[PDB]
Design a protein around this ligand. Structure first.
Ligand code: HEC
Ligand code: HEC
Ligand code: HEC
Ligand code: HEC
Ligand code: HEC
Ligand code: HEC
Ligand code: HEC
Ligand code: HEC
Ligand code: HEC
Ligand code: HEC
Ligand SMILES: [Ca+2]
Ligand SMILES: [Ca+2]
Length: 693
């Protein structure tokens, strides 16, 4: 007739209805598995807890007036907490008495929970919601929306459930809500486990909001743990700063002190988004978005701003009433609302999404490469050289010519390096600017380019690693627009696809051969947003960062020599493996190859398919012979982008027994002795399972 709770591998809790009788709350809910079969045997002695809160309209008296704060969750269960253990030698703390909302455990009431034997249950709260005054007062209103929450922790799973309803009417639809964000936006950056918080027993956003209330804080740090403030502060991370009385910028890390005085220092957090002002990463709007998704522009909260900017966001700030000056209805002189000012930041990047390069007159003059190039805005109009950016003296807006782009791009040797195939628009030796057409003419004559003997049949590419200058928002600045580069401007890379074709000697109309699918760049962009690190015209890093690219010195690494390949840069990046980095939440784990690599509709990681480029030879350093230049076969070198440092003898023999090379003197040497059969066993599916997926 049903299935026992202590045996079921899946569980779904659903509230059906709720009732309030003179402060007495009774909720009704059902338990079911994935198939929908009733789950029986839930007792009070299971890790079963319940919360109850009101969505209360809040006004705040700020001086001689009241400001609307919208609706805030107020739990009926709160406790007053004096600070427990506070660690010493830890800065940025201010221990003080704080309130904390809580749930009530069912095991405290012998007659509160009823099993109906059919998969449905009824729970009567131990708290009376009619007159809660201490330690935190909640003025009950039957017209106000109430939220019941339940959390359940079993051996095999943890479950949450919530229920919003209006007591006066019994409506669950068409009532005041505070549905702002969705867990799906969080999952764009977060491993689901990294958001299974506390015991791993708290999963749903609605549960978070029910307990992380505006009146709650951490006693041992003195920090607010209000849902909005906390999440903002956390993600501002190491970029959270403030200004003292002298007007100097000082770090303001958000720290939470917990059990035994342990320190979670969110100053260690590095938010991956560039720029970091795009609210939409969490505040998603559109079809299927939460009802109140536009609350981040309602301008009803100062705490919300303070979460990221603190109370002194500049040397010139003195008042803390953020909404008095930063709003849309009646802004302060010289400034604007958050939406507008944050909008100013985004403007340059949003514009650059419509910026592209137009190539023309491609050919050969005196056995040298030549071509014309224009840089277009989002009106399809050319921009002057004054707007073209040179970010540094070593990083310049340049055009990069590539060949063998369907394989692994040109080899890193004299004449075919990124620096040999690149041409800066500001370098008069190779670049000439026509002012009447706003067009650059490039000639490879005065360079170190070693063009292949015959380009016929080759899949070539012209890549525009180009950025454009824009002004910044600020006092009295109404609009952010393209601005000739200066000491006060900022740059943003243009965003287009590299121009690719098959060389025939006559035209650029013949399509080029496609390279294998390796990574899904939309995944890259999901976490990083507009740009990643440098040369951020899309994700075309593999044009410079080749498998045979020169070794780099890293004194913290065995042999003091590390590769510089694209795969290495991504596989080795600290933020891609947050197990012992950051706050160790495992938010990003490189072990999950589907984080970056291409996967089909059936969730098969096709991007890590082996043996698709047998002719490839990687460049590594021998961790024994002081980072001595060695050469590694195709599939092995892909594995050694993570496995090199702690590599065992048996593992080495495993490579070699199966056709692998780990001691080449050259690439040709490798191709001679290489005969890999790795794709027979190490398949995409078994590689995922081997890494814990
Ligand atoms: C009440 C039953 C809560 C629920 C539901 C959620 N949180 Fe929680 N959280 C709660 C308290 C009382 C505290 C203070 C702990 C302290 O040391 O003072 C916290 C703390 C956090 C933190 C800080 C770091 C940490 O404790 O590890 C975070 C990041 C946090 N809470 C997140 C969080 C999330 C995402 C929740 C929904 C899944 C959530 N909390 C629910 C109380 C309660
Ligand atoms: C994910 C890391 C977020 C980023 C990026 C931004 N916000 Fe946010 N915001 C986040 C959460 C979890 C919440 C609470 C949702 C809830 O159910 O309560 C919020 C809420 C806000 C609010 C509303 C505050 C209130 O009315 O009480 C505002 C005004 C707000 N956030 C502003 C804001 C802005 C301007 C952002 C871009 C700079 C931004 N947020 C980013 C999580 C995240
Ligand atoms: C974290 C998700 C934030 C929230 C919440 C708020 N702001 Fe913000 N702001 C954030 C970033 C990453 C930046 C870019 C500057 C930086 O610190 O890196 C900003 C910037 C501003 C600015 C200046 C705009 C500019 O051109 O630099 C203003 C005036 C501003 N922010 C105001 C503001 C207000 C009023 C907020 C509450 C509604 C608010 N911010 C929240 C990150 C975050
Ligand atoms: C009127 C007295 C204001 C109050 C109250 C707050 N802000 Fe402000 N802010 C104000 C002006 C005139 C300016 C300069 C114009 C501009 O848009 O930059 C600012 C600027 C900021 C900034 C950006 C500063 C910088 O990037 O160097 C931020 C991040 C900011 N304001 C945030 C902020 C917060 C969090 C506030 C509440 C504590 C707040 N402002 C109040 C005017 C006024
Ligand atoms: C979320 C699961 C991510 C995906 C998908 C990608 N990256 Fe990432 N990356 C992420 C984080 C949290 C960080 C740390 C940010 C920091 O400032 O330290 C990073 C970091 C990088 C870096 C270094 C950035 C820097 O030094 O400024 C690089 C070069 C990088 N990531 C590359 C990269 C590429 C090419 C990706 C697509 C295959 C990609 N990342 C995806 C989180 C996430
Ligand atoms: C040629 C114009 C390049 C493009 C396109 C990309 N990178 Fe790069 N990068 C290049 C050089 C010559 C160097 C210095 C030596 C080295 O190989 O390390 C770098 C450096 C990096 C680094 C480390 C240094 C740093 O700034 O953090 C990283 C993490 C890196 N490169 C990653 C990276 C990514 C993600 C790219 C696509 C957006 C990318 N590079 C493109 C040359 C070139
Ligand atoms: C990419 C831009 C992210 C988005 C979208 C969200 N989060 Fe995030 N979060 C991100 C990083 C890089 C980190 C640091 C992780 C580390 O281990 O260093 C975090 C951290 C958190 C935490 C703290 C977890 C812990 O202390 O154990 C929480 C509670 C958290 N993030 C919550 C959260 C929510 C609710 C989001 C949706 C509104 C969300 N994050 C989105 C990066 C990103
Ligand atoms: C994002 C941080 C990644 C994670 C997570 C994983 N990989 Fe990756 N890998 C990444 C990049 C940017 C590249 C190079 C892309 C390019 O254009 O050259 C790679 C490369 C590989 C390859 C080579 C595939 C081929 O040549 O056809 C393999 C086989 C590979 N990576 C394996 C792999 C595994 C097993 C992972 C889980 C442990 C994994 N990758 C995660 C970026 C990222
Ligand atoms: C960085 C993204 C990696 C790439 C590329 C490859 N591997 Fe990996 N692997 C990586 C880590 C951090 C770990 C440890 C896992 C853990 O939970 O601690 C592993 C582990 C394995 C294992 C299992 C080892 C064990 O003792 O059980 C296997 C069998 C394995 N890796 C194989 C493998 C192969 C064949 C790869 C090239 C195709 C490869 N990995 C790439 C990180 C990374
Ligand atoms: C079937 C006979 C396989 C062939 C062909 C290849 N691999 Fe393998 N690999 C296989 C198993 C059953 C295991 C785990 C047990 C073991 O004997 O190691 C592995 C392990 C690896 C590892 C992980 C080593 C470690 O984490 O210490 C790596 C890095 C690895 N294998 C690489 C590799 C390469 C490059 C291959 C093609 C030349 C290859 N393997 C083939 C099964 C089989
Ligand atoms: Ca605490
Ligand atoms: Ca965790």
């Amino acid at each position: 007739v049903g299935v026992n709770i202590n045996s079921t591998s899946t569980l779904k809790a659903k509230f059906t209805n709720a009732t309030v009788d003179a402060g007495k709350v009774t909720v009704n809910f059902t338990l079911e598995n994935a198939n929908g079969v009733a789950v029986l045997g839930l007792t009070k002695d299971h890790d079963l807890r319940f919360g109850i809160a009101q969505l209360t309209p809040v006004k705040e008296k700020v001086g001689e007036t009241e400001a609307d704060r919208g609706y805030q969750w107020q739990a009926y269960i709160n406790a007053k907490k004096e600070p427990g253990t506070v660690p010493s030698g830890v800065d940025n703390l201010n221990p003080s008495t704080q309130f904390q909302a809580n749930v009530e455990s069912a095991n405290k009431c012998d007659t509160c929970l009823v099993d109906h034997g059919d998969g449905s249950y009824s729970y009567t709260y131990q708290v009376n919601v009619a007159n809660v005054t201490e330690p935190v007062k909640v003025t009950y209103s039957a017209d106000a929306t109430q939220r019941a929450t339940m959390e359940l922790e079993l051996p095999q799973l943890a479950a949450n459930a919530h229920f919003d309803w209006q007591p006066s009417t019994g409506k669950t639809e068409g009532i005041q809500t505070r549905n702002v964000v969705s867990i799906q936006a969080c999952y764009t950056c977060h491993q689901p486990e990294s958001l299974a918080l506390h015991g791993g027993r708290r999963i749903d956003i609605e549960n978070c909001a029910s307990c992380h209330t505006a009146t709650s804080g951490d006693p041992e740090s003195g920090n607010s743990i209000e849902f909005t403030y906390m999440i903002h502060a956390i993600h501002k991370g190491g970029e959270r700063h403030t200004f003292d009385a002298t007007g100097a910028q000082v770090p303001a890390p958000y720290k939470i002190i917990g059990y035994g005085g342990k320190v979670i220092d969110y100053g260690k957090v590095h938010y991956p988004q560039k720029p970091a002002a795009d609210c939409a990463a969490c505040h998603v709007e559109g079809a299927g978005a939460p009802a109140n998704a536009d609350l981040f522009k309602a301008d009803l909260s100062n705490q919300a701003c303070i979460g990221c900017h603190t109370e002194k966001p500049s040397a010139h700030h003195s008042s803390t009433d953020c909404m008095a000056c930063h709003n849309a209805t009646k802004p302060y002189g010289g400034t604007g609302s958050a939406a507008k000012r944050h909008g100013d930041v985004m403007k340059a990047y949003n514009d650059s999404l419509g910026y592209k390069a137009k190539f023309s007159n491609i050919g050969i003059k005196n056995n040298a490469l030549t071509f014309d190039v224009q840089i277009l805005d989002n009106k399809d109009q050319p921009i002057g050289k004054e707007f073209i950016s040179d970010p540094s003296a070593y990083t310049k807006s340049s055009i990069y010519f590539s060949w063998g782009i369907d394989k692994d791009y040109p080899a890193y040797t004299a004449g075919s390096r990124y620096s040999d195939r690149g041409f800066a628009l500001s370098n008069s030796k190779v670049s000439t600017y026509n002012e009447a057409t706003k067009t650059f003419t490039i000639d490879s004559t005065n360079s170190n380019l070693k063009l292949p003997a015959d380009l016929t049949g080759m899949n070539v590419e012209l890549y525009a690693g180009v950025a454009t200058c824009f002004n910044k928002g600020g006092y009295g600045v109404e609009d952010v627009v393209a601005t000739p580069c200066s000491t006060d401007t900022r740059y943003a890379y243009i965003q287009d696809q590299p121009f690719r074709f098959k060389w025939n000697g006559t035209d650029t109309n013949s399509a080029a051969e496609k390279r294998r699918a390796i990574i899904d760049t939309a995944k890259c962009s999901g976490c990083h947003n507009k740009e990643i690190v440098h040369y951020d015209n899309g994700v075309n890093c593999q044009a410079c960062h080749t498998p045979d690219k020169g070794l780099k010195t890293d004194n913290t690494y065995p042999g003091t020599k590390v590769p510089t390949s694209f795969a290495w840069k991504a596989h080795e990046s600290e933020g891609h493996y947050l197990k012992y980095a950051g706050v160790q939440s495992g938010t990003v784990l490189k072990t999950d190859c589907a984080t970056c690599h291409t996967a089909d509709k059936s969730n098969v990681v096709t991007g890590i398919a082996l043996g698709r480029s047998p002719e490839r030879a990687w460049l590594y350093g021998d961790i024994k012979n002081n980072g001595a230049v060695i050469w590694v076969s195709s599939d092995a070198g892909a594995c050694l982008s993570c496995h090199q440092k702690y590599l065992s003898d048996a593992a080495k023999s495993h490579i070699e027994t199966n056709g692998g090379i780990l001691n080449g003197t050259s690439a040709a040497d490798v191709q001679t002795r290489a005969s890999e059969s790795c794709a027979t066993c190490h398949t995409p599916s078994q590689l995922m399972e081997a890494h814990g997926n």
